[PDB]
Design an enzyme around this catalytic site. Structure first.
Site, PDB file in Angstrom:
ATOM      1  N   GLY A 169       0.766  -1.241   0.000  1.00 28.49           N
ATOM      2  CA  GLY A 169       0.000   0.000   0.000  1.00 28.49           C
ATOM      3  C   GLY A 169       0.795   1.288   0.000  1.00 28.49           C
ATOM      4  N   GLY A 170       2.089   1.224  -0.296  1.00 27.52           N
ATOM      5  CA  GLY A 170       2.906   2.436  -0.274  1.00 27.52           C
ATOM      6  C   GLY A 170       2.601   3.367  -1.441  1.00 27.52           C
ATOM      7  N   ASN A 212       6.025  -3.842  -8.254  1.00 25.70           N
ATOM      8  CA  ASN A 212       6.273  -4.667  -7.080  1.00 25.70           C
ATOM      9  C   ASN A 212       6.720  -6.096  -7.377  1.00 25.70           C
ATOM     10  OD1 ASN A 212       4.655  -3.250  -4.259  1.00 25.70           O
ATOM     11  ND2 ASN A 212       5.075  -2.186  -6.197  1.00 25.70           N
ATOM     12  N   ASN A 245       1.604  -9.254  -0.704  1.00 27.76           N
ATOM     13  CA  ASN A 245       2.540  -8.598   0.192  1.00 27.76           C
ATOM     14  C   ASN A 245       1.854  -7.437   0.915  1.00 27.76           C
ATOM     15  OD1 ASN A 245       5.999  -7.873   0.094  1.00 27.76           O
ATOM     16  ND2 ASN A 245       4.469  -6.537   1.059  1.00 27.76           N
ATOM     17  N   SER A 294      22.432  -1.089  -0.958  1.00 28.18           N
ATOM     18  CA  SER A 294      22.978  -1.093  -2.312  1.00 28.18           C
ATOM     19  C   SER A 294      21.949  -1.478  -3.372  1.00 28.18           C
ATOM     20  CB  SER A 294      24.221  -1.991  -2.401  1.00 28.18           C
ATOM     21  OG  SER A 294      23.884  -3.368  -2.442  1.00 28.18           O
ATOM     22  N   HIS A 331      10.938  -5.264   3.914  1.00 29.62           N
ATOM     23  CA  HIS A 331       9.485  -5.354   3.612  1.00 29.62           C
ATOM     24  C   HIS A 331       9.147  -5.716   2.151  1.00 29.62           C
ATOM     25  CE1 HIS A 331       5.367  -4.706   4.769  1.00 29.62           C
ATOM     26  NE2 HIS A 331       5.175  -3.621   4.040  1.00 29.62           N
ATOM     27  N   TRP A 332      10.158  -6.085   1.356  1.00 32.41           N
ATOM     28  CA  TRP A 332       9.921  -6.388  -0.071  1.00 32.41           C
ATOM     29  C   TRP A 332      10.636  -7.693  -0.398  1.00 32.41           C
ATOM     30  CZ3 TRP A 332      11.585  -2.543  -4.627  1.00 32.41           C
ATOM     31  CH2 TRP A 332      10.797  -2.796  -5.763  1.00 32.41           C
TER      32      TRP A 332
HETATM   33  O1  LIG Z   1       5.191  -2.988  -0.213  1.00 33.81           O
HETATM   34  C1  LIG Z   1       4.951  -1.837  -0.649  1.00 33.81           C
HETATM   35  O2  LIG Z   1       4.686  -1.637  -1.849  1.00 33.81           O
HETATM   36  C2  LIG Z   1       4.993  -0.677   0.244  1.00 33.81           C
HETATM   37  O3  LIG Z   1       5.507   0.458  -0.223  1.00 33.81           O
HETATM   38  C3  LIG Z   1       4.550  -0.714   1.506  1.00 33.81           C
HETATM   39  F1  LIG Z   1       5.079   0.139   2.403  1.00 33.81           F
HETATM   40  C4  LIG Z   1       3.500  -1.648   1.960  1.00 33.81           C
HETATM   41  C5  LIG Z   1       3.013  -1.578   3.204  1.00 33.81           C
HETATM   42  C6  LIG Z   1       1.614  -1.959   3.455  1.00 33.81           C
HETATM   43  O4  LIG Z   1       0.899  -2.253   2.524  1.00 33.81           O
HETATM   44  C7  LIG Z   1       1.053  -2.025   4.841  1.00 33.81           C
HETATM   45  C8  LIG Z   1      -0.328  -2.117   4.986  1.00 33.81           C
HETATM   46  C9  LIG Z   1      -0.895  -2.338   6.238  1.00 33.81           C
HETATM   47  C10 LIG Z   1      -0.055  -2.472   7.342  1.00 33.81           C
HETATM   48  F2  LIG Z   1      -0.575  -2.688   8.566  1.00 33.81           F
HETATM   49  C11 LIG Z   1       1.327  -2.379   7.198  1.00 33.81           C
HETATM   50  C12 LIG Z   1       1.894  -2.165   5.945  1.00 33.81           C
HETATM   51 NA    NA Z   2      25.774  -0.314  -6.234  1.00 34.55          NA
END
Ligand SMILES: O=C(O)/C(O)=C(F)\C=C\C(=O)c1ccc(F)cc1
Ligand code: NA
Ligand SMILES: O=C(O)/C(O)=C(F)\C=C\C(=O)c1ccc(F)cc1
Ligand SMILES: O=C(O)/C(O)=C(F)\C=C\C(=O)c1ccc(F)cc1
Ligand SMILES: O=C(O)/C(O)=C(F)\C=C\C(=O)c1ccc(F)cc1
Ligand code: NA
Ligand code: NA
Ligand code: NA
Lengths: 283, 283, 283, 283
Positions: free
Chosen positions: B39-40, B48, B108, B177, B262-263
């Site tokens: 959700g970013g 993604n 994700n 990096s 987180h990815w």
């Molecule tokens: O993975 C991504 O695209 C991104 O930029 C994020 F920061 C995703 C985070 C979330 O979707 C998110 C939603 C709900 C939550 F509780 C925590 C994180």
């Molecule tokens: Na580099």
């Protein structure tokens, strides 16, 4: 493959061991993977890993299911040092005797402690490291110790009986329908066959308690790529130790099986075999 | 495969959505796997998952990288219900429009919440469930909330800037990096292109805070075989939620990558692809 | 009691320190309790403990609020060893100079590390041990490191500004309504007054990183009755370290305050004072 | 104070209970504190709390040690709903019969579940809430379930024997030197005296399993100031549930005793009494 057809013996000579007989089961002929068993009464290589040897051999590995000193068909021994380290010396002794330069190690519980000690002491002799609920890594942040399973293991060592064996296996495994007559009879036979191993284990444990096994402070030395597995429902070694290893070893990953006790390689054999073979191939 | 060559649009009609435009990237033609993004600000399907689409297609799957409502090239929307559920309705709408009977879901973060809601609401339309750090599962037992990453996500939504984007990506990823000019420029473009999505997201979050997303109490309903992944070093969703899912879903396993933010599907793409493809094939 | 009325200086001479000036604030005349502050820019004894000194004095203790070397009004210093140990030597130096045989120690964060090191190095000179979120105890099982708060502490040391101070305090405290103009102005003054301390701290941190502070392996040596406190919402030192101490120190208890950041003795002063005074009296 | 001198009976009438006899032990005459016992075979108010009643009375409270329905000297009952809720109705019935407007509640294990249910159902009738290892709060993030202690509790209910009682108490308490002949003989007498309670408990547990007790989702409703205690070494209810309560109840604190099993108020009576009396006085 059968226990009988794969059975071999080799005498080892390594720091403390002199013409010491090690039993092992060998199959396959490719890259060597040594699998190291847990410390319960009657434990051994074949009994602990017979659901794994075939698929690993099919995948092209040479599999060695080693009996640790003081277990199954290996020589009797009383140890005055922590078993992980003494067992690791015995693995090195076996590899030297068999002209094996490097091995991948797979170790469950005591065998996980053995594998960690081996990685620490002989880093140039190890490939990859596979750990299934390794024992002896100090206190848990959540579980009171000694853990439920460990109390039962000590009860069975000190007062072996068919009923106590059944009680232990009920705690050892998550799915109760896996406790067949075959499993019970087999484990009971191995206990009856080697009463001296039971007595010696208890003497050894008095000389070097589980607290002496803790190599946590040295985990940053491990350079082997490491795959850690845990049973979610393990009542013998605490789940949070999976996290301890994951944070402290440089290159690790952690896989936790649901509905799984202290014998993940047997309780979840298909998934375990696939994951570990993929790890050895691609990591 | 490129974004342009795989780009498709479809109008959906499902409980609340009326002739609503969904953008998606499609490749391959076998069993359908729908991948659902986080959700970013500036998030979308292609951005993604572009390190995953190729190997999944090579493995014989039809891959659909879906843009959730209010993201990337899908229609703008203000949501008054928790996003996981609303997003799940949009997945169902897409599947109905494309004549897809059952899909495997990979999700994700927000996409993980979407996938959980989909499994709960439409159990006969899901195959397997793959969750990478799903969001919104209530409090952590260890991490203060809102988590560090979430504070940055809200800062970037409310005051988008190139510098704040860089700060967020530094927290988002473990290995610094990996933050190339290409990654930064691309993410910045997607933020600049859709300022209305940013504004609408913030309005939506006021109407339905993260506390409304918590489906923990219903996890026992999930009958899908489930594979949970977590980055050890995830600063956006707490590691202990991996355990929450593992204990509460009937048939789950948990895999935790070291040195991973987180990815995970991008930071550990090779291992992720191998594990998830094996899961879809053999579990 | 005021800062000015309680202010004293003493020169210490102890392993590495030669005629080294230590500032402290003293009140009361009973059994000595030395309170040891955290390591943030501008930290000092009075500023960190002024909500505690009165009630402890009322309870009949002599309270010494010590400025650690390289903080506030104590002499400037560059340290090449971990700060906990160096600080502990300075406490011993102060006690010797003041003819104090035994002291109870209260330490927050860096001050908690100081107190642990003191208990280890000088067990015959300590009474009871009170630890509030001690720092430097190795990795967390859950929290990615460096923790959010620590990143901000290093940012503020390297680039001190009023805005960055405000950001840090927002993370430091749970209840935002505690961040008054008085708190901000006071903390800003202490940073402006001693720029050399800021520079020296950063040089010291390069010479002896936080990993060098970890005394976990020695916690079994601590014979002092110990009271551990943690803020539930501490973003600077991880909650699970409270458990680490509880399992590894022989005679400990753990108290966790809800709605509480990294300054528990100030954020929950009334409850903290009551609990710690009761502990000193009755444990 | 003795059991005999404090013993009273009262008939209650409340939602499901009709002229139902409740036994309780009462001493003191100030603000009422009702103490609620755990669910083990032979449990009761006096037996569980006799090390607490005196100091609370000395502190000026009226202490009521209540026997829950189906325990000790209260009437026999088979319950078809979760025991926490049914027990809470019985507390309300007792308070109405005795003209008590508000009570502070102290509850261990089953009694902790009772107290939580009471706080949820009758918020205007509760003062402060003291919880010692409350049971039934769903899965643990770390402990396999059923926990070791719970397996033993069910064994003892179904096949009561002196030997099984001894085994259970060994798990129940951390310090084995607390298991005196007096403790064993007393607990054995209470089991022998009421075999119908044992049988009824097991029937009740089949009708409403521990999973039905979980009130986690409602914890945000609790407005009572709450003090949570846990034994570090509790083998009956998992330590992480202390964290669950701390994160989910608005105004809570958590205190964990080292070297302490499932009977903290007895194993650490002095510290427990001091902390809880201070909480009631000052929080
Ligand atoms: O993975 C991504 O695209 C991104 O930029 C994020 F920061 C995703 C985070 C979330 O979707 C998110 C939603 C709900 C939550 F509780 C925590 C994180
Ligand atoms: Na580099
Ligand atoms: O896996 C087995 O064969 C077995 O019967 C065991 F119970 C193994 C347990 C251990 O080896 C063990 C060793 C050390 C420890 F701390 C915990 C468990
Ligand atoms: O409490 C303070 O005065 C303060 O401003 C701090 F941020 C204190 C933090 C530490 O001393 C600290 C030291 C070491 C560590 F690992 C974590 C935190
Ligand atoms: O404390 C006691 O009196 C006792 O003998 C117990 F074993 C109490 C245990 C419980 O009441 C219990 C209830 C529910 C649960 F989930 C776990 C434990
Ligand atoms: Na069967
Ligand atoms: Na204000
Ligand atoms: Na005794």
């Amino acid at each position: 493959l059968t226990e009988s057809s794969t059975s071999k013996f080799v005498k080892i000579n390594e720091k403390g061991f002199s013409d010491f007989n090690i039993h092992y089961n060998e199959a396959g002929n490719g890259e060597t993977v040594i699998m190291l068993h847990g410390g319960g009464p009657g434990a051994g290589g074949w009994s602990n890993y017979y659901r794994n040897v075939g698929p690993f051999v099919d995948a092209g590995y040479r599999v060695i299911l080693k009996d640790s000193p003081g277990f199954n068909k290996s020589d009797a021994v009383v140890m005055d040092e922590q078993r992980g380290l003494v067992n690791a010396r015995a693995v090195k002794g076996l590899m030297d005797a068999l002209d094996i330069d490097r091995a991948h190690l797979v170790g469950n519980a005591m065998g996980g402690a053995t594998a960690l000690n081996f990685a620490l002491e002989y880093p140039d002799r190890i490939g990859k490291l596979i750990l299934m609920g390794p024992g002896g890594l100090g206190p848990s942040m959540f579980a009171p110790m000694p853990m439920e399973g460990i109390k039962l293991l000590f009860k069975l060592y000190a007062e072996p009986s068919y009923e106590t064996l059944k009680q232990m296996l009920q705690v050892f495994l998550y799915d109760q329908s896996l406790i067949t007559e075959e499993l019970l009879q087999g484990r009971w036979e191995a206990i009856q066959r080697q009463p001296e191993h039971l007595k010696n284990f208890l003497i050894s444990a008095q000389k070097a308690p589980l607290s002496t096994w803790d190599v946590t402070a040295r985990l940053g030395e491990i350079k082997a790529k490491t795959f850690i597995t845990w049973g979610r429902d393990d009542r013998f070694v605490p789940l949070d130790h999976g996290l301890k290893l994951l944070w402290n070893i440089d290159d690790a990953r952690l896989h936790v099986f649901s509905k799984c006790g202290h014998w993940a390689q047997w309780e979840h054999a298909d998934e375990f075999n696939r994951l570990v073979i993929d790890f050895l191939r691609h990591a």
